[PDB]
Amino acid sequence: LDNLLRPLLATFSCDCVADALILRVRSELSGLPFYWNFHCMLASPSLVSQHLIRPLMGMSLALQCQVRELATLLHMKDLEIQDYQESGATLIRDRLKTEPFEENSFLEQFMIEKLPEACSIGDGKPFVMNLQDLYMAVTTQ
Amino acid sequence: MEELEQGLLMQPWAWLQLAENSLLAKVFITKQGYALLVSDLQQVWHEQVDTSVVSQRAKELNKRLTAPPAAFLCHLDNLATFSCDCVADALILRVRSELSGLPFYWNFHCMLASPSLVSQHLIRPLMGMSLALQCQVRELATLLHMKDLEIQDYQESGATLIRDRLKTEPFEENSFLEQFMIEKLPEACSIGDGKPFVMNLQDLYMAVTTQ
Amino acid sequence: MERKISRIHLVSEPSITHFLQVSWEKTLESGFVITLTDGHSAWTGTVSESEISQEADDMAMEKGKYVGELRKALLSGAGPADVYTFNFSKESCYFFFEKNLKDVSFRLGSFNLEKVENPAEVIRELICYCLDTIAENQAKNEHL
């Protein structure tokens, strides 16, 4: 089962009896076929708590801290570029000039333009690609 | 009613101080009734009530000096002493408040919230906000690389730094994610009592609920 | 022994000034006798300490705080933000009185009343008292 799943994580079928989700594998082993069925009852809200929500809250706030510190880094690089122009008495090619960073505008524009796609749930595909590392780390912490 | 629900869905989270513990709540009040959701950051509960239940229950809990349910609803909007009990799963929130210049009392008989709405209110929203936050981090990072391009443009030709304390190391995500993991991830990801969430993230919460 | 009389208007009688007289021993909580009139007829009722306890403990309130409120309402201790309102039916001899906040009324208490058989006698008594009261302040002002 492990050798089959780790690559993918053979064909699969899933069905939900009233509450439980039932997962069926069609595959082969030793040339011979192997059939197994998964019988997954709706998970517990302590399990839901610990595996999704509390970690997912954790995601949200940790990335908030990410944004805060990265915004302040933006401001410090603004200070460096200002030191370059106002007193450094030097210019550039004028093709790389960047606007001084402010988080309020940045946020308004992110939420006006990018947010409709930034928060998209989708298939859970982007979730399981982009942050599972942070997922793991915060589970550990 | 369903307006109560949809508004609640857009309602951000408050944070509650009980004498026993802390709580987080999102509530949608109208003159028609209320839409609440409460959690202790391990479990969630739900209660939905209209003015008839409001009226009868207030009468039982609070009797004379009587009024329109909407008046109580208004005072609840004002938003006192909070207590609760997890009778079997009816987390019965017991609130003593001051209404009409006098002691008030209500019980929110908050049963465990439903997995559908639980998705609807935390997980789907939480997942949404976390992903939006990652998009924000990516965009701030590309901005910092634009800035790194601009600074390196100065560094290739003259442009000596005057203030010997304004130096910034070139921005590369991986190492800073690492230092975030080591130095400050523990303090950051600490769940605590739900206070930081109600403090800082409600903007994004309401935004993600809208989207 | 404290007496306190108050010019009032029942909602049923906007143009009639009614007069609320209160007599009590330093303490409205201990119980009091109440008399209402309108210049042609008068009524009297009575309330006890335990009645006030029961009222205040159905107010969800500390007794005494509700007593201060009562001082405001019946002994004219009401302030500018205070808007009490009084209702009485002469046919039923039932009084009650309320408090106006949130564009709404809140019945504070309510008394069983009875019409007095001798309105003119209580009237003479009240107004003799009042005359005396007047006169005192007059003399005081003179000296001052």
Q: What is the DSSP string of B80-114?
A: -EEEEEESSS-EEEEEEEEETTEEEEEEEEEEE--
Q: How was this structure determined?
A: cryo-EM
Q: Which of C58, C59, C102 sits opposite B71 (nearest CB)?
A: C102
Distance, CA of B130 to CA of A56 (rounded, Å): 7
Closest to C42 measured CA to CA, from C113, C98, C109: C113
Taking the CA of residue B33 and the nearest CA in chain A, the distance in Å comes to: 28
Give B-chain residues touching C107 at CB under 8 angstroms.
Answer: 64-66
Using the Cβ of B60 and the Cβ atoms of chain C, whether some distance falls under 8 Å is answered with: no
Whether the CB of B105 is below 8 Å from some CB of chain C: the reply is: yes
Is B103 in Cβ contact with C107 (below 8 Å)? no
**A99-103 long-range CB contacts below 8 Å, 24 or more apart?**
A101/A71, A101/A74, A101/A75, A101/A77, A101/B143, A101/B147, A103/A67, A103/A71
Rg (C-alpha) for chain C, rounded Å, is 16
CA distance C123 to C18: 12
Residues of chain B in contact with residue A53, where contact means CB-CB under 8 angstroms, are 122-123, 126
Tell me the residue length of chain B.
Answer: 211
Cβ contact B162–A88 (<8 Å): yes
Residues 6+ apart with CB under 8 A from B114: B46
Round to whole Å and give the CA distance between A109 and B143: 14
CA C62, distance to chain mean position in Å, is 21
To the nearest 10°, report the CA torsion of B172, B176, B177, B179.
150
Q: Compute the distance between CA of residue C76 and CA of residue C35 in angstroms, rounded to an integer.
A: 15
CA distance A14 to chain B (A): 20
Distance CA B1, CA B31 (A): 10
Residues A35-45: b if buried by 16+ CB within 10 A, e if exposed? eeeeeeeeeeb
Q: How many residues make up chain C in this entry? A: 144
Contact residues for A141 (Cβ-Cβ < 8 A; gap 6+): A58, B185, B186, B189
Cβ count within 10 A of residue A14: 11
SS3 C126: helix
Q: Which residue has tokens 């936050």? A: B133
Residue B124 has, within 13 A of its CA and on its CB side, a CA count of 14
Nearest to B100 by CA among C99, C95, C117: C99
| Residues closing a segment before a gap in chain B (C–N exceeding 2.5 Å) | 79
State the greatest distance between any 2 C-alpha atoms of chain A, in Å, as a whole number. Answer: 77
Tokens representing B22? 């802390």
Q: Which contacts (CB < 8 Å, 24+ apart) does range C6-15 have?
A: C6/C74, C6/C75, C6/C76, C8/C36, C8/C86, C9/C86, C10/C86, C10/C87, C10/C88, C11/C85, C11/C86, C11/C87, C12/C87, C12/C88, C12/C89, C13/C38
The structure tokens 């990652």 sit at B134
Distance CA B84, CA B93 (A): 4
User: SS in 3 state form for C76-115?
Assistant: CCCCCCCCEEEEEECCCCEEEEEEEECCEEEEEEEEEEEE
Pair C36, C88: CB distance under 8 Å: yes
CA-nearest residue to C97 within chain B is: B65
CB contact under 8 A, A84 and B184: no
Give the number of other CB atoms < 10 A from CB of residue B128: 24
Q: Any alpha helices (H) in chain B, and if so which ranges?
A: 2-10, 51-62, 69-78, 115-118, 124-156, 173-179, 185-189, 195-200, 202-210
d(CA A32, CA B207) in angstroms, rounded, equals 53
Facing residues of B112 across strands? B45
Residue B205 burial by Cβ neighbours in a 10 Å radius (0-12, 13-18, 19+): buried
Q: From residue C5, give the alpha-carbon distance in Å to each of A68, C36, C82.
A: 68, 9, 18
* Angstroms from A30 CA to nearest CA on chain B: 41
The DSSP code for A129 is H
Q: Which whole-number Å values give the CA distances from C73 to A135, C70, C100, in the listed order?
A: 64, 5, 11
Torsion from C-alpha of C66, C68, C71, C72, nearest 10 degrees:
-90
Q: Which two tokens stand for residue A86?
A: 């106002």
**Cβ–Cβ contact C126 with B under 8 A:** no
Radius of gyration of chain B (CA): 24
**Measured between alpha carbons, how far is A68 from B199 in angstroms, rounded to an integer?**
14
Contacts of B170 (CB under 8 A, 6+ apart): B148, B152
Assign residue C93 a region (left: φ > 0; alpha: ψ between -120 and 50; beta: otherwise). Answer: left
Chains meeting B at 3+ CB pairs closer than 8 A? A, C
Please state, in angstroms and rounded to a whole number, the distance separating the CA atoms of residues B126 and B128: 5
DSSP secondary structure letter of residue A84:
I
Chain B touches chain A, with at least 3 Cβ pairs below 8 Å, answer yes
Long-range contacts of A62-65 (CB under 8 A, 24+ apart): A62/A134, A62/A138, A62/B180, A62/B185, A62/B188, A62/B189, A63/A134, A63/B130, A63/B133, A63/B134, A63/B136, A63/B137, A64/B133, A64/B200, A64/B201, A64/B204, A65/B180, A65/B184, A65/B188
